[PDB]
Amino acid sequence: QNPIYVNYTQEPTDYISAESLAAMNAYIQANPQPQAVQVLKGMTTAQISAYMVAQVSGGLKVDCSYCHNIANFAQQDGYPNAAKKVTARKMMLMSADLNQNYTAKL
Amino acid sequence: KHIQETYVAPGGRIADGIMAGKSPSCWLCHQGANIPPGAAKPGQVPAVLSSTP
Ligand code: HEC
Ligand code: HEC
């Protein structure tokens, strides 16, 4: 009876460390608005973080450091996990297209 | 078919796709059910990535 998914759940979030959560809260406090977003528009930092806890990193069951740099969430390159972030952005655009012009016909 | 032609092997070459050349199937989303268990209920996906816009 998850309020997001039909028959799926992510709730036992043992895959997210405590330092990741502390960094998330600190970044939310220090930045009310997102600093560098190209796909997710019309959302605050808190909403983006909630999305990245529930559906991103909760649909793959990975940690916040799989794609990001914990020190600075707005950083784009300089760490060995930037290609993952690029692929994730492309997969967001693909999902938008897929449910925008193919499941809207049902 | 669109997923195969656009994101798996765009232009006929696997190297340009965002997947490791893994073609989709009906079972990939529907894991034995008529509605995929990982499908999001209406109003739960960021509006920019939904069917409404
Ligand atoms: C790879 C699947 C990721 C995981 C794991 C996490 N995030 Fe993420 N994040 C990802 C991408 C591709 C983007 C860019 C979105 C865009 O439109 O360009 C982001 C962005 C954020 C942001 C926004 C910060 C900013 O733009 O300045 C935040 C605050 C954020 N992500 C938080 C966050 C947290 C807390 C995570 C662990 C639960 C996490 N992300 C994981 C991809 C991925
Ligand atoms: C993930 C990208 C999927 C792929 C691959 C396939 N389907 Fe699917 N299907 C998907 C969603 C998100 C939904 C629900 C959308 C909605 O608005 O209801 C569906 C639904 C169906 C249905 C309807 C089931 C019903 O009870 O009415 C059918 C008959 C269906 N899908 C068929 C189908 C076939 C034959 C596929 C392989 C060629 C296939 N789907 C793949 C998501 C995804």
Side-chain angles (χ1 to χ4, degrees), chain A residues 36-60:
Chain A
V37 278
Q38 309 176 11
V39 175
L40 304 178
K41 288 326 235 283
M43 294 204 298
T44 42
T45 305
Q47 293 173 335
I48 293 183
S49 301
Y51 169 62
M52 299 268 159
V53 171
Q55 295 173 34
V56 184
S57 165
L60 313 204

mmCIF file with all atom_site columns, all heavy atoms in Angstrom, chain A residues 36-60:
data_model
loop_
_atom_site.group_PDB
_atom_site.id
_atom_site.type_symbol
_atom_site.label_atom_id
_atom_site.label_alt_id
_atom_site.label_comp_id
_atom_site.label_asym_id
_atom_site.label_entity_id
_atom_site.label_seq_id
_atom_site.pdbx_PDB_ins_code
_atom_site.Cartn_x
_atom_site.Cartn_y
_atom_site.Cartn_z
_atom_site.occupancy
_atom_site.B_iso_or_equiv
_atom_site.pdbx_formal_charge
_atom_site.auth_seq_id
_atom_site.auth_comp_id
_atom_site.auth_asym_id
_atom_site.auth_atom_id
_atom_site.pdbx_PDB_model_num
ATOM 1   N N   . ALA A 1 36 ? 21.812 24.206 -10.452 1.00 0.00 ? 36 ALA A N   1
ATOM 2   C CA  . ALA A 1 36 ? 22.066 23.864 -11.854 1.00 0.00 ? 36 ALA A CA  1
ATOM 3   C C   . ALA A 1 36 ? 21.162 22.687 -12.224 1.00 0.00 ? 36 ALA A C   1
ATOM 4   O O   . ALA A 1 36 ? 21.524 21.526 -12.023 1.00 0.00 ? 36 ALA A O   1
ATOM 5   C CB  . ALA A 1 36 ? 23.533 23.538 -12.087 1.00 0.00 ? 36 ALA A CB  1
ATOM 6   N N   . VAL A 1 37 ? 19.997 23.001 -12.784 1.00 0.00 ? 37 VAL A N   1
ATOM 7   C CA  . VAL A 1 37 ? 19.033 22.002 -13.227 1.00 0.00 ? 37 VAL A CA  1
ATOM 8   C C   . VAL A 1 37 ? 18.669 22.288 -14.675 1.00 0.00 ? 37 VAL A C   1
ATOM 9   O O   . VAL A 1 37 ? 18.375 23.434 -15.032 1.00 0.00 ? 37 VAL A O   1
ATOM 10  C CB  . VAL A 1 37 ? 17.771 21.989 -12.346 1.00 0.00 ? 37 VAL A CB  1
ATOM 11  C CG1 . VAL A 1 37 ? 18.009 21.174 -11.094 1.00 0.00 ? 37 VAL A CG1 1
ATOM 12  C CG2 . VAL A 1 37 ? 17.370 23.404 -11.986 1.00 0.00 ? 37 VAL A CG2 1
ATOM 13  N N   . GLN A 1 38 ? 18.690 21.247 -15.508 1.00 0.00 ? 38 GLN A N   1
ATOM 14  C CA  . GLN A 1 38 ? 18.345 21.367 -16.914 1.00 0.00 ? 38 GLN A CA  1
ATOM 15  C C   . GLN A 1 38 ? 17.066 20.643 -17.299 1.00 0.00 ? 38 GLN A C   1
ATOM 16  O O   . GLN A 1 38 ? 16.512 20.935 -18.362 1.00 0.00 ? 38 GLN A O   1
ATOM 17  C CB  . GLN A 1 38 ? 19.487 20.835 -17.794 1.00 0.00 ? 38 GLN A CB  1
ATOM 18  C CG  . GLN A 1 38 ? 20.849 21.403 -17.456 1.00 0.00 ? 38 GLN A CG  1
ATOM 19  C CD  . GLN A 1 38 ? 21.957 20.775 -18.273 1.00 0.00 ? 38 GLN A CD  1
ATOM 20  O OE1 . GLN A 1 38 ? 21.702 20.057 -19.237 1.00 0.00 ? 38 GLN A OE1 1
ATOM 21  N NE2 . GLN A 1 38 ? 23.198 21.037 -17.887 1.00 0.00 ? 38 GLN A NE2 1
ATOM 22  N N   . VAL A 1 39 ? 16.583 19.712 -16.475 1.00 0.00 ? 39 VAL A N   1
ATOM 23  C CA  . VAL A 1 39 ? 15.402 18.921 -16.782 1.00 0.00 ? 39 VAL A CA  1
ATOM 24  C C   . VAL A 1 39 ? 14.295 19.135 -15.759 1.00 0.00 ? 39 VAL A C   1
ATOM 25  O O   . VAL A 1 39 ? 13.129 19.310 -16.129 1.00 0.00 ? 39 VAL A O   1
ATOM 26  C CB  . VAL A 1 39 ? 15.754 17.421 -16.892 1.00 0.00 ? 39 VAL A CB  1
ATOM 27  C CG1 . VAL A 1 39 ? 14.502 16.589 -17.078 1.00 0.00 ? 39 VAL A CG1 1
ATOM 28  C CG2 . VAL A 1 39 ? 16.720 17.192 -18.035 1.00 0.00 ? 39 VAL A CG2 1
ATOM 29  N N   . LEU A 1 40 ? 14.631 19.134 -14.472 1.00 0.00 ? 40 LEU A N   1
ATOM 30  C CA  . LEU A 1 40 ? 13.640 19.290 -13.413 1.00 0.00 ? 40 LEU A CA  1
ATOM 31  C C   . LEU A 1 40 ? 13.391 20.775 -13.184 1.00 0.00 ? 40 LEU A C   1
ATOM 32  O O   . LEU A 1 40 ? 14.213 21.465 -12.574 1.00 0.00 ? 40 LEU A O   1
ATOM 33  C CB  . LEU A 1 40 ? 14.116 18.606 -12.137 1.00 0.00 ? 40 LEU A CB  1
ATOM 34  C CG  . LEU A 1 40 ? 14.462 17.121 -12.264 1.00 0.00 ? 40 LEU A CG  1
ATOM 35  C CD1 . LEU A 1 40 ? 14.969 16.574 -10.946 1.00 0.00 ? 40 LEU A CD1 1
ATOM 36  C CD2 . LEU A 1 40 ? 13.261 16.328 -12.743 1.00 0.00 ? 40 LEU A CD2 1
ATOM 37  N N   . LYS A 1 41 ? 12.253 21.268 -13.664 1.00 0.00 ? 41 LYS A N   1
ATOM 38  C CA  . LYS A 1 41 ? 11.906 22.678 -13.578 1.00 0.00 ? 41 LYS A CA  1
ATOM 39  C C   . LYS A 1 41 ? 10.665 22.864 -12.716 1.00 0.00 ? 41 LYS A C   1
ATOM 40  O O   . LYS A 1 41 ? 9.852  21.952 -12.549 1.00 0.00 ? 41 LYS A O   1
ATOM 41  C CB  . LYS A 1 41 ? 11.667 23.278 -14.969 1.00 0.00 ? 41 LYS A CB  1
ATOM 42  C CG  . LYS A 1 41 ? 12.925 23.455 -15.798 1.00 0.00 ? 41 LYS A CG  1
ATOM 43  C CD  . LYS A 1 41 ? 14.117 23.795 -14.928 1.00 0.00 ? 41 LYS A CD  1
ATOM 44  C CE  . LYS A 1 41 ? 14.783 25.080 -15.387 1.00 0.00 ? 41 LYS A CE  1
ATOM 45  N NZ  . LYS A 1 41 ? 15.619 24.872 -16.600 1.00 0.00 ? 41 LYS A NZ  1
ATOM 46  N N   . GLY A 1 42 ? 10.529 24.070 -12.172 1.00 0.00 ? 42 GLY A N   1
ATOM 47  C CA  . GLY A 1 42 ? 9.401  24.385 -11.318 1.00 0.00 ? 42 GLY A CA  1
ATOM 48  C C   . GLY A 1 42 ? 9.353  23.608 -10.023 1.00 0.00 ? 42 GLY A C   1
ATOM 49  O O   . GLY A 1 42 ? 8.262  23.316 -9.524  1.00 0.00 ? 42 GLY A O   1
ATOM 50  N N   . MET A 1 43 ? 10.510 23.265 -9.461  1.00 0.00 ? 43 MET A N   1
ATOM 51  C CA  . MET A 1 43 ? 10.579 22.561 -8.190  1.00 0.00 ? 43 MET A CA  1
ATOM 52  C C   . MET A 1 43 ? 11.640 23.209 -7.315  1.00 0.00 ? 43 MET A C   1
ATOM 53  O O   . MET A 1 43 ? 12.647 23.720 -7.809  1.00 0.00 ? 43 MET A O   1
ATOM 54  C CB  . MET A 1 43 ? 10.897 21.071 -8.377  1.00 0.00 ? 43 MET A CB  1
ATOM 55  C CG  . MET A 1 43 ? 9.805  20.279 -9.073  1.00 0.00 ? 43 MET A CG  1
ATOM 56  S SD  . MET A 1 43 ? 9.855  18.517 -8.693  1.00 0.00 ? 43 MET A SD  1
ATOM 57  C CE  . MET A 1 43 ? 11.453 18.064 -9.349  1.00 0.00 ? 43 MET A CE  1
ATOM 58  N N   . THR A 1 44 ? 11.400 23.184 -6.007  1.00 0.00 ? 44 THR A N   1
ATOM 59  C CA  . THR A 1 44 ? 12.370 23.677 -5.042  1.00 0.00 ? 44 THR A CA  1
ATOM 60  C C   . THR A 1 44 ? 13.423 22.607 -4.768  1.00 0.00 ? 44 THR A C   1
ATOM 61  O O   . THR A 1 44 ? 13.359 21.486 -5.278  1.00 0.00 ? 44 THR A O   1
ATOM 62  C CB  . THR A 1 44 ? 11.671 24.099 -3.752  1.00 0.00 ? 44 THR A CB  1
ATOM 63  O OG1 . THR A 1 44 ? 10.664 23.138 -3.415  1.00 0.00 ? 44 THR A OG1 1
ATOM 64  C CG2 . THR A 1 44 ? 11.030 25.464 -3.917  1.00 0.00 ? 44 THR A CG2 1
ATOM 65  N N   . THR A 1 45 ? 14.419 22.957 -3.952  1.00 0.00 ? 45 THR A N   1
ATOM 66  C CA  . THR A 1 45 ? 15.445 21.984 -3.594  1.00 0.00 ? 45 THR A CA  1
ATOM 67  C C   . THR A 1 45 ? 14.869 20.864 -2.737  1.00 0.00 ? 45 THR A C   1
ATOM 68  O O   . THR A 1 45 ? 15.274 19.704 -2.871  1.00 0.00 ? 45 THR A O   1
ATOM 69  C CB  . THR A 1 45 ? 16.601 22.675 -2.871  1.00 0.00 ? 45 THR A CB  1
ATOM 70  O OG1 . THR A 1 45 ? 17.100 23.745 -3.679  1.00 0.00 ? 45 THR A OG1 1
ATOM 71  C CG2 . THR A 1 45 ? 17.728 21.700 -2.616  1.00 0.00 ? 45 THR A CG2 1
ATOM 72  N N   . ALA A 1 46 ? 13.928 21.191 -1.849  1.00 0.00 ? 46 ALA A N   1
ATOM 73  C CA  . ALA A 1 46 ? 13.332 20.169 -0.993  1.00 0.00 ? 46 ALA A CA  1
ATOM 74  C C   . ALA A 1 46 ? 12.545 19.150 -1.808  1.00 0.00 ? 46 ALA A C   1
ATOM 75  O O   . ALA A 1 46 ? 12.630 17.942 -1.555  1.00 0.00 ? 46 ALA A O   1
ATOM 76  C CB  . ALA A 1 46 ? 12.437 20.821 0.059   1.00 0.00 ? 46 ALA A CB  1
ATOM 77  N N   . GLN A 1 47 ? 11.770 19.615 -2.788  1.00 0.00 ? 47 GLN A N   1
ATOM 78  C CA  . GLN A 1 47 ? 11.016 18.694 -3.634  1.00 0.00 ? 47 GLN A CA  1
ATOM 79  C C   . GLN A 1 47 ? 11.944 17.828 -4.478  1.00 0.00 ? 47 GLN A C   1
ATOM 80  O O   . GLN A 1 47 ? 11.698 16.628 -4.649  1.00 0.00 ? 47 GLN A O   1
ATOM 81  C CB  . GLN A 1 47 ? 10.048 19.474 -4.519  1.00 0.00 ? 47 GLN A CB  1
ATOM 82  C CG  . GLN A 1 47 ? 8.930  20.149 -3.750  1.00 0.00 ? 47 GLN A CG  1
ATOM 83  C CD  . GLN A 1 47 ? 8.079  21.048 -4.619  1.00 0.00 ? 47 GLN A CD  1
ATOM 84  O OE1 . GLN A 1 47 ? 8.534  21.547 -5.645  1.00 0.00 ? 47 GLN A OE1 1
ATOM 85  N NE2 . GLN A 1 47 ? 6.835  21.258 -4.213  1.00 0.00 ? 47 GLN A NE2 1
ATOM 86  N N   . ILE A 1 48 ? 13.016 18.418 -5.011  1.00 0.00 ? 48 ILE A N   1
ATOM 87  C CA  . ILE A 1 48 ? 13.982 17.642 -5.784  1.00 0.00 ? 48 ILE A CA  1
ATOM 88  C C   . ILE A 1 48 ? 14.634 16.580 -4.909  1.00 0.00 ? 48 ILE A C   1
ATOM 89  O O   . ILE A 1 48 ? 14.816 15.436 -5.334  1.00 0.00 ? 48 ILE A O   1
ATOM 90  C CB  . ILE A 1 48 ? 15.030 18.568 -6.426  1.00 0.00 ? 48 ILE A CB  1
ATOM 91  C CG1 . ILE A 1 48 ? 14.381 19.455 -7.484  1.00 0.00 ? 48 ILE A CG1 1
ATOM 92  C CG2 . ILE A 1 48 ? 16.139 17.757 -7.059  1.00 0.00 ? 48 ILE A CG2 1
ATOM 93  C CD1 . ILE A 1 48 ? 15.360 20.340 -8.208  1.00 0.00 ? 48 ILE A CD1 1
ATOM 94  N N   . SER A 1 49 ? 14.994 16.939 -3.675  1.00 0.00 ? 49 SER A N   1
ATOM 95  C CA  . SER A 1 49 ? 15.600 15.969 -2.768  1.00 0.00 ? 49 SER A CA  1
ATOM 96  C C   . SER A 1 49 ? 14.627 14.852 -2.412  1.00 0.00 ? 49 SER A C   1
ATOM 97  O O   . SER A 1 49 ? 15.016 13.682 -2.338  1.00 0.00 ? 49 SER A O   1
ATOM 98  C CB  . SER A 1 49 ? 16.090 16.673 -1.507  1.00 0.00 ? 49 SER A CB  1
ATOM 99  O OG  . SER A 1 49 ? 17.035 17.676 -1.827  1.00 0.00 ? 49 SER A OG  1
ATOM 100 N N   . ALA A 1 50 ? 13.356 15.192 -2.186  1.00 0.00 ? 50 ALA A N   1
ATOM 101 C CA  . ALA A 1 50 ? 12.359 14.164 -1.902  1.00 0.00 ? 50 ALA A CA  1
ATOM 102 C C   . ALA A 1 50 ? 12.199 13.214 -3.081  1.00 0.00 ? 50 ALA A C   1
ATOM 103 O O   . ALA A 1 50 ? 12.077 11.997 -2.899  1.00 0.00 ? 50 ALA A O   1
ATOM 104 C CB  . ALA A 1 50 ? 11.024 14.814 -1.550  1.00 0.00 ? 50 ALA A CB  1
ATOM 105 N N   . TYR A 1 51 ? 12.191 13.757 -4.300  1.00 0.00 ? 51 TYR A N   1
ATOM 106 C CA  . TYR A 1 51 ? 12.135 12.918 -5.492  1.00 0.00 ? 51 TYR A CA  1
ATOM 107 C C   . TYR A 1 51 ? 13.366 12.027 -5.598  1.00 0.00 ? 51 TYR A C   1
ATOM 108 O O   . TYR A 1 51 ? 13.255 10.838 -5.917  1.00 0.00 ? 51 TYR A O   1
ATOM 109 C CB  . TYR A 1 51 ? 11.987 13.801 -6.732  1.00 0.00 ? 51 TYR A CB  1
ATOM 110 C CG  . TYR A 1 51 ? 12.183 13.089 -8.048  1.00 0.00 ? 51 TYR A CG  1
ATOM 111 C CD1 . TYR A 1 51 ? 11.352 12.051 -8.429  1.00 0.00 ? 51 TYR A CD1 1
ATOM 112 C CD2 . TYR A 1 51 ? 13.186 13.475 -8.919  1.00 0.00 ? 51 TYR A CD2 1
ATOM 113 C CE1 . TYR A 1 51 ? 11.528 11.405 -9.629  1.00 0.00 ? 51 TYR A CE1 1
ATOM 114 C CE2 . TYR A 1 51 ? 13.367 12.836 -10.118 1.00 0.00 ? 51 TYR A CE2 1
ATOM 115 C CZ  . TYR A 1 51 ? 12.537 11.802 -10.468 1.00 0.00 ? 51 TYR A CZ  1
ATOM 116 O OH  . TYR A 1 51 ? 12.712 11.163 -11.668 1.00 0.00 ? 51 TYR A OH  1
ATOM 117 N N   . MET A 1 52 ? 14.528 12.570 -5.258  1.00 0.00 ? 52 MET A N   1
ATOM 118 C CA  . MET A 1 52 ? 15.789 11.809 -5.396  1.00 0.00 ? 52 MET A CA  1
ATOM 119 C C   . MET A 1 52 ? 15.939 10.827 -4.246  1.00 0.00 ? 52 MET A C   1
ATOM 120 O O   . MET A 1 52 ? 16.903 10.084 -4.276  1.00 0.00 ? 52 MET A O   1
ATOM 121 C CB  . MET A 1 52 ? 16.986 12.752 -5.424  1.00 0.00 ? 52 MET A CB  1
ATOM 122 C CG  . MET A 1 52 ? 16.959 13.726 -6.563  1.00 0.00 ? 52 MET A CG  1
ATOM 123 S SD  . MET A 1 52 ? 17.818 13.158 -8.014  1.00 0.00 ? 52 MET A SD  1
ATOM 124 C CE  . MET A 1 52 ? 17.042 14.196 -9.246  1.00 0.00 ? 52 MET A CE  1
ATOM 125 N N   . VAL A 1 53 ? 15.101 10.900 -3.221  1.00 0.00 ? 53 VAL A N   1
ATOM 126 C CA  . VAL A 1 53 ? 15.088 9.874  -2.183  1.00 0.00 ? 53 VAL A CA  1
ATOM 127 C C   . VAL A 1 53 ? 14.054 8.793  -2.479  1.00 0.00 ? 53 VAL A C   1
ATOM 128 O O   . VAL A 1 53 ? 14.309 7.607  -2.259  1.00 0.00 ? 53 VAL A O   1
ATOM 129 C CB  . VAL A 1 53 ? 14.851 10.520 -0.803  1.00 0.00 ? 53 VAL A CB  1
ATOM 130 C CG1 . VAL A 1 53 ? 14.624 9.457  0.253   1.00 0.00 ? 53 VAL A CG1 1
ATOM 131 C CG2 . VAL A 1 53 ? 16.028 11.386 -0.420  1.00 0.00 ? 53 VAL A CG2 1
ATOM 132 N N   . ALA A 1 54 ? 12.884 9.172  -2.998  1.00 0.00 ? 54 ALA A N   1
ATOM 133 C CA  . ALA A 1 54 ? 11.796 8.211  -3.159  1.00 0.00 ? 54 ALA A CA  1
ATOM 134 C C   . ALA A 1 54 ? 11.903 7.422  -4.461  1.00 0.00 ? 54 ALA A C   1
ATOM 135 O O   . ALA A 1 54 ? 11.799 6.192  -4.453  1.00 0.00 ? 54 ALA A O   1
ATOM 136 C CB  . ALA A 1 54 ? 10.450 8.929  -3.088  1.00 0.00 ? 54 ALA A CB  1
ATOM 137 N N   . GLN A 1 55 ? 12.093 8.105  -5.590  1.00 0.00 ? 55 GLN A N   1
ATOM 138 C CA  . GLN A 1 55 ? 11.998 7.465  -6.899  1.00 0.00 ? 55 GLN A CA  1
ATOM 139 C C   . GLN A 1 55 ? 13.347 7.286  -7.579  1.00 0.00 ? 55 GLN A C   1
ATOM 140 O O   . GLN A 1 55 ? 13.625 6.213  -8.118  1.00 0.00 ? 55 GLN A O   1
ATOM 141 C CB  . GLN A 1 55 ? 11.048 8.261  -7.797  1.00 0.00 ? 55 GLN A CB  1
ATOM 142 C CG  . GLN A 1 55 ? 9.621  8.257  -7.286  1.00 0.00 ? 55 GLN A CG  1
ATOM 143 C CD  . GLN A 1 55 ? 8.718  9.175  -8.060  1.00 0.00 ? 55 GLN A CD  1
ATOM 144 O OE1 . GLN A 1 55 ? 8.877  9.350  -9.263  1.00 0.00 ? 55 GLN A OE1 1
ATOM 145 N NE2 . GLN A 1 55 ? 7.764  9.778  -7.370  1.00 0.00 ? 55 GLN A NE2 1
ATOM 146 N N   . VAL A 1 56 ? 14.182 8.312  -7.594  1.00 0.00 ? 56 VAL A N   1
ATOM 147 C CA  . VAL A 1 56 ? 15.584 8.124  -7.948  1.00 0.00 ? 56 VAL A CA  1
ATOM 148 C C   . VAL A 1 56 ? 16.305 7.607  -6.714  1.00 0.00 ? 56 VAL A C   1
ATOM 149 O O   . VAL A 1 56 ? 15.933 7.933  -5.583  1.00 0.00 ? 56 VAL A O   1
ATOM 150 C CB  . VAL A 1 56 ? 16.213 9.431  -8.469  1.00 0.00 ? 56 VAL A CB  1
ATOM 151 C CG1 . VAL A 1 56 ? 17.632 9.192  -8.925  1.00 0.00 ? 56 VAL A CG1 1
ATOM 152 C CG2 . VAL A 1 56 ? 15.395 9.993  -9.601  1.00 0.00 ? 56 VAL A CG2 1
ATOM 153 N N   . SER A 1 57 ? 17.295 6.739  -6.918  1.00 0.00 ? 57 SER A N   1
ATOM 154 C CA  . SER A 1 57 ? 18.049 6.151  -5.812  1.00 0.00 ? 57 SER A CA  1
ATOM 155 C C   . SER A 1 57 ? 17.161 5.306  -4.908  1.00 0.00 ? 57 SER A C   1
ATOM 156 O O   . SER A 1 57 ? 17.625 4.780  -3.895  1.00 0.00 ? 57 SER A O   1
ATOM 157 C CB  . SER A 1 57 ? 18.750 7.236  -4.992  1.00 0.00 ? 57 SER A CB  1
ATOM 158 O OG  . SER A 1 57 ? 19.186 6.731  -3.747  1.00 0.00 ? 57 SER A OG  1
ATOM 159 N N   . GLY A 1 58 ? 15.889 5.175  -5.264  1.00 0.00 ? 58 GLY A N   1
ATOM 160 C CA  . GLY A 1 58 ? 14.967 4.296  -4.580  1.00 0.00 ? 58 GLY A CA  1
ATOM 161 C C   . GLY A 1 58 ? 14.347 3.348  -5.578  1.00 0.00 ? 58 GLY A C   1
ATOM 162 O O   . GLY A 1 58 ? 13.697 2.367  -5.211  1.00 0.00 ? 58 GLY A O   1
ATOM 163 N N   . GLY A 1 59 ? 14.540 3.651  -6.857  1.00 0.00 ? 59 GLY A N   1
ATOM 164 C CA  . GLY A 1 59 ? 14.148 2.762  -7.927  1.00 0.00 ? 59 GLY A CA  1
ATOM 165 C C   . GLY A 1 59 ? 15.323 1.934  -8.389  1.00 0.00 ? 59 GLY A C   1
ATOM 166 O O   . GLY A 1 59 ? 15.149 0.840  -8.927  1.00 0.00 ? 59 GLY A O   1
ATOM 167 N N   . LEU A 1 60 ? 16.531 2.459  -8.183  1.00 0.00 ? 60 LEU A N   1
ATOM 168 C CA  . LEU A 1 60 ? 17.762 1.721  -8.422  1.00 0.00 ? 60 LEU A CA  1
ATOM 169 C C   . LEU A 1 60 ? 18.340 1.116  -7.154  1.00 0.00 ? 60 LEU A C   1
ATOM 170 O O   . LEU A 1 60 ? 19.206 0.244  -7.247  1.00 0.00 ? 60 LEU A O   1
ATOM 171 C CB  . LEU A 1 60 ? 18.826 2.622  -9.066  1.00 0.00 ? 60 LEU A CB  1
ATOM 172 C CG  . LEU A 1 60 ? 18.529 3.532  -10.261 1.00 0.00 ? 60 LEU A CG  1
ATOM 173 C CD1 . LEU A 1 60 ? 19.814 3.821  -11.008 1.00 0.00 ? 60 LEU A CD1 1
ATOM 174 C CD2 . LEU A 1 60 ? 17.499 2.951  -11.195 1.00 0.00 ? 60 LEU A CD2 1
#
